[PDB]
Write a protein that binds this ligand. Sequence first.
Ligand SMILES: CCCCC/C=C\C/C=C\CCCCCCCC(=O)O
Ligand code: NA
Length: 281
Amino acid sequence: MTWKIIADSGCDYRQLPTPAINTTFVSVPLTIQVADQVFVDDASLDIDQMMETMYATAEASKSACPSPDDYLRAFEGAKNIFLVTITGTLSGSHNSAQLAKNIYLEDHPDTKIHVIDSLSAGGEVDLLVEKLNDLIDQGLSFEEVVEAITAYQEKTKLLFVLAKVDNLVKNGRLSKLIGTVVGLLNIRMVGKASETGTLELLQKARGSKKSVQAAYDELVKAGYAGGRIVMAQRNNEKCCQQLSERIRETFPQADIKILPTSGLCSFYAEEGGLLMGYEID
Ligand SMILES: CCCCC/C=C\C/C=C\CCCCCCCC(=O)O
Ligand code: NA
């Protein structure tokens, strides 16, 4: 009776804290191409060297999603499989995962697989993976877990704050329309994952302290009530500690984690970026 939780590198975990029994976690890396060099976003990756190279290269850098075959490899040795991808609207990760599922079940019929399009990235995907692990530790059946995680995904949201969005624009994942009005000269984009898995603007905040206030206000407005938060950040630990204190001051039971971004999430959120997943109602 074996379980695998699979996620692409839009999830910031390389290791899943305290995996449930008979459960293994696997991250499936996306890639980032900088000139004629390729960086694979696995735990071997020196994220700091990749970013330095990217910013040093006048030519735009590009991301790519996992092959279906990459997903097929990850399935091996498990009978109960959940696969969470980054938003299938901005990346083909989910499309490859959908195909891998259908291909594997031709080859290995006594297997159960549930593919979750997070419609998100970063901290919210992290929460979903943590919850899947929770649910398995709790002793649920495969179909019980599918039910509970579908419900939990209605309870989870994403807020981001980005000081730069150039790589998003350069890669066609954010319009020049929105892209020019933020991430330029003291203006950080405060946004959420939209109902379709896209970037949606919420506030422009001029400076840090205004960035924290906006993020706190948006959390309140969205219906946070003291549950779990996962803040995935790129060189933004100080803004994350000051936001965390404020949230804990208001909601004393808050369970907050701060994680470094993956290579993919670092690439797109960029320096100073934050992708905060959280629970509501
Ligand atoms: C909907 C989530 C929006 C999050 C916005 C904030 C920061 C962006 C950081 C990570 C998300 C990147 C999404 C695009 C991935 C493309 C991968 C590919 O090449 O296939
Ligand atoms: Na959600």
